[PDB]
Amino acid sequence: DSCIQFTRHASDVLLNLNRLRSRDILTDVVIVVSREQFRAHKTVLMACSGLFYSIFTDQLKCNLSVINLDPEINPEGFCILLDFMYTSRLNLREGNIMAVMATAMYLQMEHVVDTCRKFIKASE
Amino acid sequence: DSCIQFTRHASDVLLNLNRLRSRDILTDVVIVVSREQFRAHKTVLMACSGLFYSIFTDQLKCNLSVINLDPEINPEGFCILLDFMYTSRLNLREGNIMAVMATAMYLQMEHVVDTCRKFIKASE
C-alpha cells in the first residue's frame, strides 16, 4: 500500500495498556499462582503467551474470570513475565533466571526462553 | 533498573491484537458510524483515542456493548483510523485526508491530527 507509519505507535499503545493495568481498568481475569493473584487483560496475555492464547480461544475457558496455574509455577517468575508482557522490559537476574526461564517455557514465551538460555550458557 | 528490553515486543503485541480483531476474538464492543458497524477491543480503542479513553472510564458507559458516534462522522475515515490503531499504518490519501483529520480530531488522536495538518499545509 501507500500507507505512512507512526514509529512510536506500538510502544505508546503498550504504555497505555500498562497504565490501565496499574489502575486496574477493564482487567477481565485473575491469574492465580499459588497464594498470589495477578489481575490482567486476557487480550494482552494472549498476545504475549502461547499458553494464554490456547486458554482464551477455548470455547469454555474463554469465559472464565479465574485461571489457576500449575502449582510448580513461581509467583515471582510470573510477576517478572507479566511486567515484561506490558512493558517489553525483562528483570533478568542471577537469582531469578531459573524461575523466569521455567515460567516462560510453561507460558510459551519463545523470545524470553531464548535470552534465558543464552544468559545461562554464558555463565557456565 | 537493570532490565533488558526486547525491541520488537510492542510491535509483536499489536500484530497479535490485530490478528484477534481480524478473527473477531474477544472483541467486546461495536462502534456504530451511521449505517456501518465496527467490532473492536475497548482496551485498544482507549490506548489510541482520548475520546474512547474518556468513554470507557465512565462508570456507566464502560458497560455498554454498543457505542454510537456523532452522525457527522464518516465511516471510511473511522475505518482508516481503526486500522491505524491496530497496525501503526495510516492510509492517508488526497481523497480521504479531510475525513480522516475530522475523525482524528473527534477521536482525540493527536499524532494523526498533526500529520494531516502537515500534509494539508504542503498542498496549499
Binding site: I4, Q5, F6, T7 | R89
Partner: peptide, 4 residues
C-alpha cells in the same frame, strides 16, 4: 512518521 515514516515510509514503512
Amino acid at each position: 512518521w515514516v515510509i514503512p
